[PDB]
Amino acid sequence: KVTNEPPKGLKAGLYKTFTTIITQEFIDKVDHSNWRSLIFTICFLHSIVIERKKFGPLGWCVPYEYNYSDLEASLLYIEKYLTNLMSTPQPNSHNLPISMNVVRYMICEVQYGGRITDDLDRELFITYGETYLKDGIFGNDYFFPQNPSAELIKYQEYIAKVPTVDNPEVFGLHSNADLTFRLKESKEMINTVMETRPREEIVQDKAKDMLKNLPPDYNDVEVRELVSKLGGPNPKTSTERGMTVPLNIFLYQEVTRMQRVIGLVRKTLQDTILAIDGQIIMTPEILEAINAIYDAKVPNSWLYDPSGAEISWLLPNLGSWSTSLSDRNKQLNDWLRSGQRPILFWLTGFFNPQGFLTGMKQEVTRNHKKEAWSLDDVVYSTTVKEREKEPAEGVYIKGLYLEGCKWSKNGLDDSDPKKIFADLPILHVSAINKSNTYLCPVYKYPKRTDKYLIFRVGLPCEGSNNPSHWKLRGVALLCSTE
Amino acid sequence: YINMVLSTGEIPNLLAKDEREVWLGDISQAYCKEKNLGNIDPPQSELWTYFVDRVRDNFHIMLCFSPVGQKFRERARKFPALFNECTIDWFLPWPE
Amino acid sequence: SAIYFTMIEVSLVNWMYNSSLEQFLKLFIESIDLSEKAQLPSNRVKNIISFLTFHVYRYVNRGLFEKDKITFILMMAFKILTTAGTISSGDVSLFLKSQKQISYLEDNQWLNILALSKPFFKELPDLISRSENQWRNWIDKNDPENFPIPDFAESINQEKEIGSFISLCLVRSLRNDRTLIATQNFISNVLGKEFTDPISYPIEGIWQESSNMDPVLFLLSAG
Amino acid sequence: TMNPGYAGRQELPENLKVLFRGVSMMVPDREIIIKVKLASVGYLQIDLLAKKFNVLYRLCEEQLSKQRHYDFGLRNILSVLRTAGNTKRQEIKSDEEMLLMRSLRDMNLSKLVADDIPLFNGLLADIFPKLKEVPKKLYPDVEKKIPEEINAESYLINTPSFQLKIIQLYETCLVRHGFMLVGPTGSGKSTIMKILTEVLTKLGSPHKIVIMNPKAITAEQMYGVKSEISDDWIPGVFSTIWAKSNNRALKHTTWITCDGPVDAIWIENLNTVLDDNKILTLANGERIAMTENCKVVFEVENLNNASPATVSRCGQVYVSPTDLGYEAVIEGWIRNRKASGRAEESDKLGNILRKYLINMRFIELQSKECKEPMMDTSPVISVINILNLLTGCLQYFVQTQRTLSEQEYEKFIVYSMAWAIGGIYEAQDRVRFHELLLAKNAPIPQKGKENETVFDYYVSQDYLDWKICSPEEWVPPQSLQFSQLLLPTLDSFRAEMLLNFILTQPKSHTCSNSALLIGGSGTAKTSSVLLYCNKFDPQKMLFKRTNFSSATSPFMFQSTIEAECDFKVGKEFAPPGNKMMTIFIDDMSMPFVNKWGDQITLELVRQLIETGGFYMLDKTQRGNQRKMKNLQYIGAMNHPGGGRNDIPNRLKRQFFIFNMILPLSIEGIYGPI
Amino acid sequence: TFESAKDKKNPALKQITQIQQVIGRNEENISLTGYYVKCEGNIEDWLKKLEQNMQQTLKDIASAAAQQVFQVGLKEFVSSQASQIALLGLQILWTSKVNEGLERLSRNERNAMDIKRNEIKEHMNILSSMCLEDLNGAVERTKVETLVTIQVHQKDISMDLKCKDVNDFEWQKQTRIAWKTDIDECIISITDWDSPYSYEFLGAKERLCITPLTDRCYITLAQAMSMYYGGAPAGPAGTG
Ligand SMILES: Nc1ncnc2c1ncn2[C@@H]1O[C@H](COP(=O)(O)OP(=O)(O)OP(=O)(O)O)[C@@H](O)[C@H]1O
């Protein structure tokens, strides 16, 4: 058995690229000026976007498998383009009269357009084409990273001078990216030896002391009463009411799912300890629960179902998981038991954050300009409250986290403190119609996929750096920190 | 089936496949002196009553189960009359 | 025997990491043929432990993947120490799985305080650890293990029979960021620095192993 | 169009991956479809209306209550559009948005349960704000013809809820292929269907209705199969009804009614008939085309085993219990009381009944502790129970045609409603219920009341007294333990006293003449029951015994009931069955509950109690039912909760349920022997 | 249809004169042929002749249609031509007119581009008002909304089409068409990939809507064909 997997070097990939389709693609030119730079542009694009995945979710949401099939494809086209253009050209002003805007659309949304499953990777890849292609062949400029002459062995020495280890600012990405790369490569490495190896003692007693610490159930015959006794967007605008206000029905829906999880955990903790201390024919699931209780990872019985029921999947057994579940029930209880609406809502605790926002939308249409405003006419916006120390329409959200700059006057993050708090981003809704702005996503978990995209936030704070600088930098406003 | 035998004893349409009547006519002759209705007459359904009386009086059932395995406890739980009417004289667990 | 019961469980992490005991027997009998007998049999017995480990070690690495390189070396250390040093499986699980007191440190760090708090781990999170006199620079300094050694238990770090495993439980609980260069460190200590070094298979040399009666498998990756 | 990874799915060789180029298609659309459908209809405000549709249906999907029969998919959208076609096709030139709001609202009104209506229309107001209100287009011929037949029948009362339900039914019949009438039992779905067919028949254009129930006949018989013995074909009943109905040159308008909840296995193969194809395909290779002469209706209660593929294929109308609900049901019973016994009885009973029921029922649930209602119920069952008990309390005076004062009736109310609400409680609950009655209720026995509850005493018919006793009787001279069968206990006597009252009543509405004890394992269930059964008169009153285990099936219960009756009493038969017969069950809880939570076992009994009879399984004929013109039913429960199973809540509405406590007097039972 | 031409001393030969596509029971689309196809002794001969004459007649009717689209006005040619030809005419109309407006913008600041945009805006109303609400026949019905989907997407692109000239990205983003006259032939253009129309009689078919994802896929397959490969799409159940 022999393994011959590839390395993660920019030169190494670039040098290999320069030993796949060479000495007949490079020598059959009939032009040393224009398309020679076009080849150099696409192969540099090729080696950069492939190596970008080294960092992880910051560079690419999921791994993609770009290969030369797209590269040597991208070539066959621009050749057919340039041959048919110059077939009617009886004389070249300066080596060409090309209008290189079609090649953008193609290299952007076709060749590497097949693998892309995410939406954000679309414009992210279009931005890379913009900064690298320049929309023109300058002939005389410094690549952000040098620029070639027109000889083959010159390309080899060009590749020879390239440094071995580079810095992520060649991708436009921040220098602190080295940390998270080691960490995830660290994590997945241990995770494998955690599978080389895959007990009935005091540990089951420790869990026995645990199940008398999680909060009790909320009997619906009481909860249906509670949500119905009191509820309203503002005490002055309306009397107490239940079903009609979107925030009370959201209260109910959240208490149901919370109760659904609280019942399962209390039961499985019991039946796990009620097999040795108690008596029952041993269950494979209970045995899997015992092994998970000893280790750090919670059992699958609380995270996934045959199709999927992700609830609060966090890493440790009790360090954060039961901590997060407790905090959710705590903030849900005072949101219920006292029944008043507190300031500084915690968006992470809610299972469905989107319904919270659309509920706010409906609230504004009903309470305000009602009639004057229709639900299809209201649009969404946000004003981030640039303050530390401190109702009106909109909400106050707590616990957001930014990555890579500050709240306002966004600057370069220091070496440490990769994840930074996000200040109070009060919301704002207005009816429609009644390019300096940068748009950011909001991901629930740090996995950064198409799902968990709750809403998008316009972040106008630019100064001298255009938003494309931030787009390549991959800034985002995530919610959890794990 | 054995649970319904314990409880009622009348198997649905097993002794009633055109045979209950002939079987009971083969017992009315014992009936006439057993119940002793002044040695005068009898009836029809009461003959079946006395027949089920006789069969449940003279049908003893001994069930002998394993204490170990997986099925015994859940079988007892599925059938209530199994453990219930049946007296439990408990065989000693081979003491010393 | 302790070494062999390590390469068995690597078949459980992934298929195709499967091999017999006969191949290990040929590797074992060979290792005695290669460099075992020169003179002074007792020192040659210690030449077994130095050479036998490296021979089987490099043989399994030829079929290992990149994400599995530091894995197999980590268990070989543990399985070696599960018999001689009598390392507790509970302490092993403490090294694999795991705040009111400290105020300056972060909630992300406070999770790790409650992580380490729950022998003397439950005895030195007090004012000794809450001194906050020079360890603040230590937590700030990159590579916290090498130059600015924690003096929390100096003598326990000097003994080194278990002080390595003690320092690694401290490193992982405090700073999971630098767990892995530290993983190379104590692997290089307990087993020798000759395991933490680059390897590259000369395909000319690999051809020498391949007789006519055995094929050459190739577990490749994309690109 | 390769596909990434299932069971039976392999990989492409690296030789083959070089050739192909990836193409990513992730998310389908909903808005462009809306606007192109508004086009296909013919509108002019397409782009704004599409946003209206999308936002309205999305909000109604997410922020509304979760009900299983709810559907807001592309099929509902396409139906709305194909309706809106004609609405613009008329000479109308008003703004399209008025017509659109009207169409959307009047289309989606039907399915929603009572609670979602205010939310629905308050959501409509947030999207159509410039429009304030539009009247619903009313059909004058229908709205005038309904009350004529409502009055022509004798026992029909006209209600605006009946009007609105029957008109929504009319509209959904106008629009869609087939429909379901979802709603609880005793709510009038069959009556609505009948009166609707009548109003369609009045102005010419006749209408016929056929009835069938799918889960009482086997599906292979329902649709016909190939014989497994002789290699020849056998017809299937549903297909025969279809071929007999869908012929042209007829004057009927046939409505095939399936009656009984939807299990996917048998209904999903009607996707072609309930879709736009309108074609039946059989495994025989036979296709038969649908005609406008035919409609498919499902008088099903509710959908619990239904996928969206069938939920969204046909229309639906939801009938609610409030048509006749709690105090309204009381009022209907008072209307029945003022029919014949109309001297003063309705008024003189109601003068207490009203306040005694409205201001008292909710102060017994959780006002006092009452934290052990072993049978968790809804109020309406306790109410219907006190009603059927009160009819049996007063039947004697109704027979002898005597009119009593108001105090006697107050005490009869108190006696009847002590039980039937106190029959689900234990001794400490009965004494707290007792002190509540002492505090704020009409007088109960006060003569001695020596540490005794109100439940011990009873109202005497001869005079206004609370006495109770058990007669003395020793044994026959025989010495068998069975000869020492049972003794005249006070618990047995009071059980008979409660039981006979409801067992004499002659099949009134809301009354099925069926009893239910609740006792612990070994708490004199069969003792008291058999004590009652021995008192039967076999010359006009028979008895049948049956027990339950886990694995008893419809074949078993169907067979034992068919062997009990031995005749089809429906077609003028059973001289020996012309006597009354009763069926006694020791434990209806034991049969297996399915993995979903719906035990299938009690459904046959449910149909037998509610409508009587069932569909035969004899390999000869399928669409037909045996009928039971007369049968009685009694059963016992074993303290449900925890390890003990529970009966479906749908059937709780029929059985008179009450407790059977331990005797607390076992010193006086074995004294005589 | 088969028309018997009676040759002298030979039994009358059945020749094809028109082709029809039937959907349902009555609804159908009929297409005449000027160039005829005659039966023969060899089956491949008259099959091939059917194919070739169909291709040629489709070509020449499209050649006349490219002219009649602009001369008569919308309603006339939309009602006269078939669905395929009407869609082609609408697309070529829109492309040519947007080109004209762009070049007039390139000359100086002009209203001409906006006036052409407004002409499309006007076409939308006269289309959607009448021929969508009331109509006879299933094929005539489906043709209409087949046009209206395309027209709504046309308008949706034309409102935000902020390109300065033909070279621009936003204009060389979509599926354009050009029926060249100097060499009489249709050419469907993508950014620069071009392919000639294949002239297969399809009648009225229910083509679907155009989402940016479908755009992405058009781009991808266009280049896959430019590079002589085969697009192999992948994904989850039912996404088009
Ligand atoms: N129409 C009906 N009326 C009354 N009871 C019914 C009816 N249909 C089914 N049942 C009940 O269902 C019981 C049989 O259960 P059934 O065999 O359907 O279970 P199942 O879902 O097939 O699961 P399994 O195959 O494991 O038994 C019958 O004995 C009967 O009590």
Ligand SMILES: Nc1ncnc2c1ncn2[C@@H]1O[C@H](COP(=O)(O)OP(=O)(O)O)[C@@H](O)[C@H]1O
């Ligand atoms: N890119 C895509 N667009 C639309 N549908 C897709 C795509 N990929 C897969 N499908 C759908 O998936 C269904 C079958 O895929 P299944 O996912 O076969 O894959 P596997 O057999 O590998 O599990 C088909 O109905 C097909 O329409």
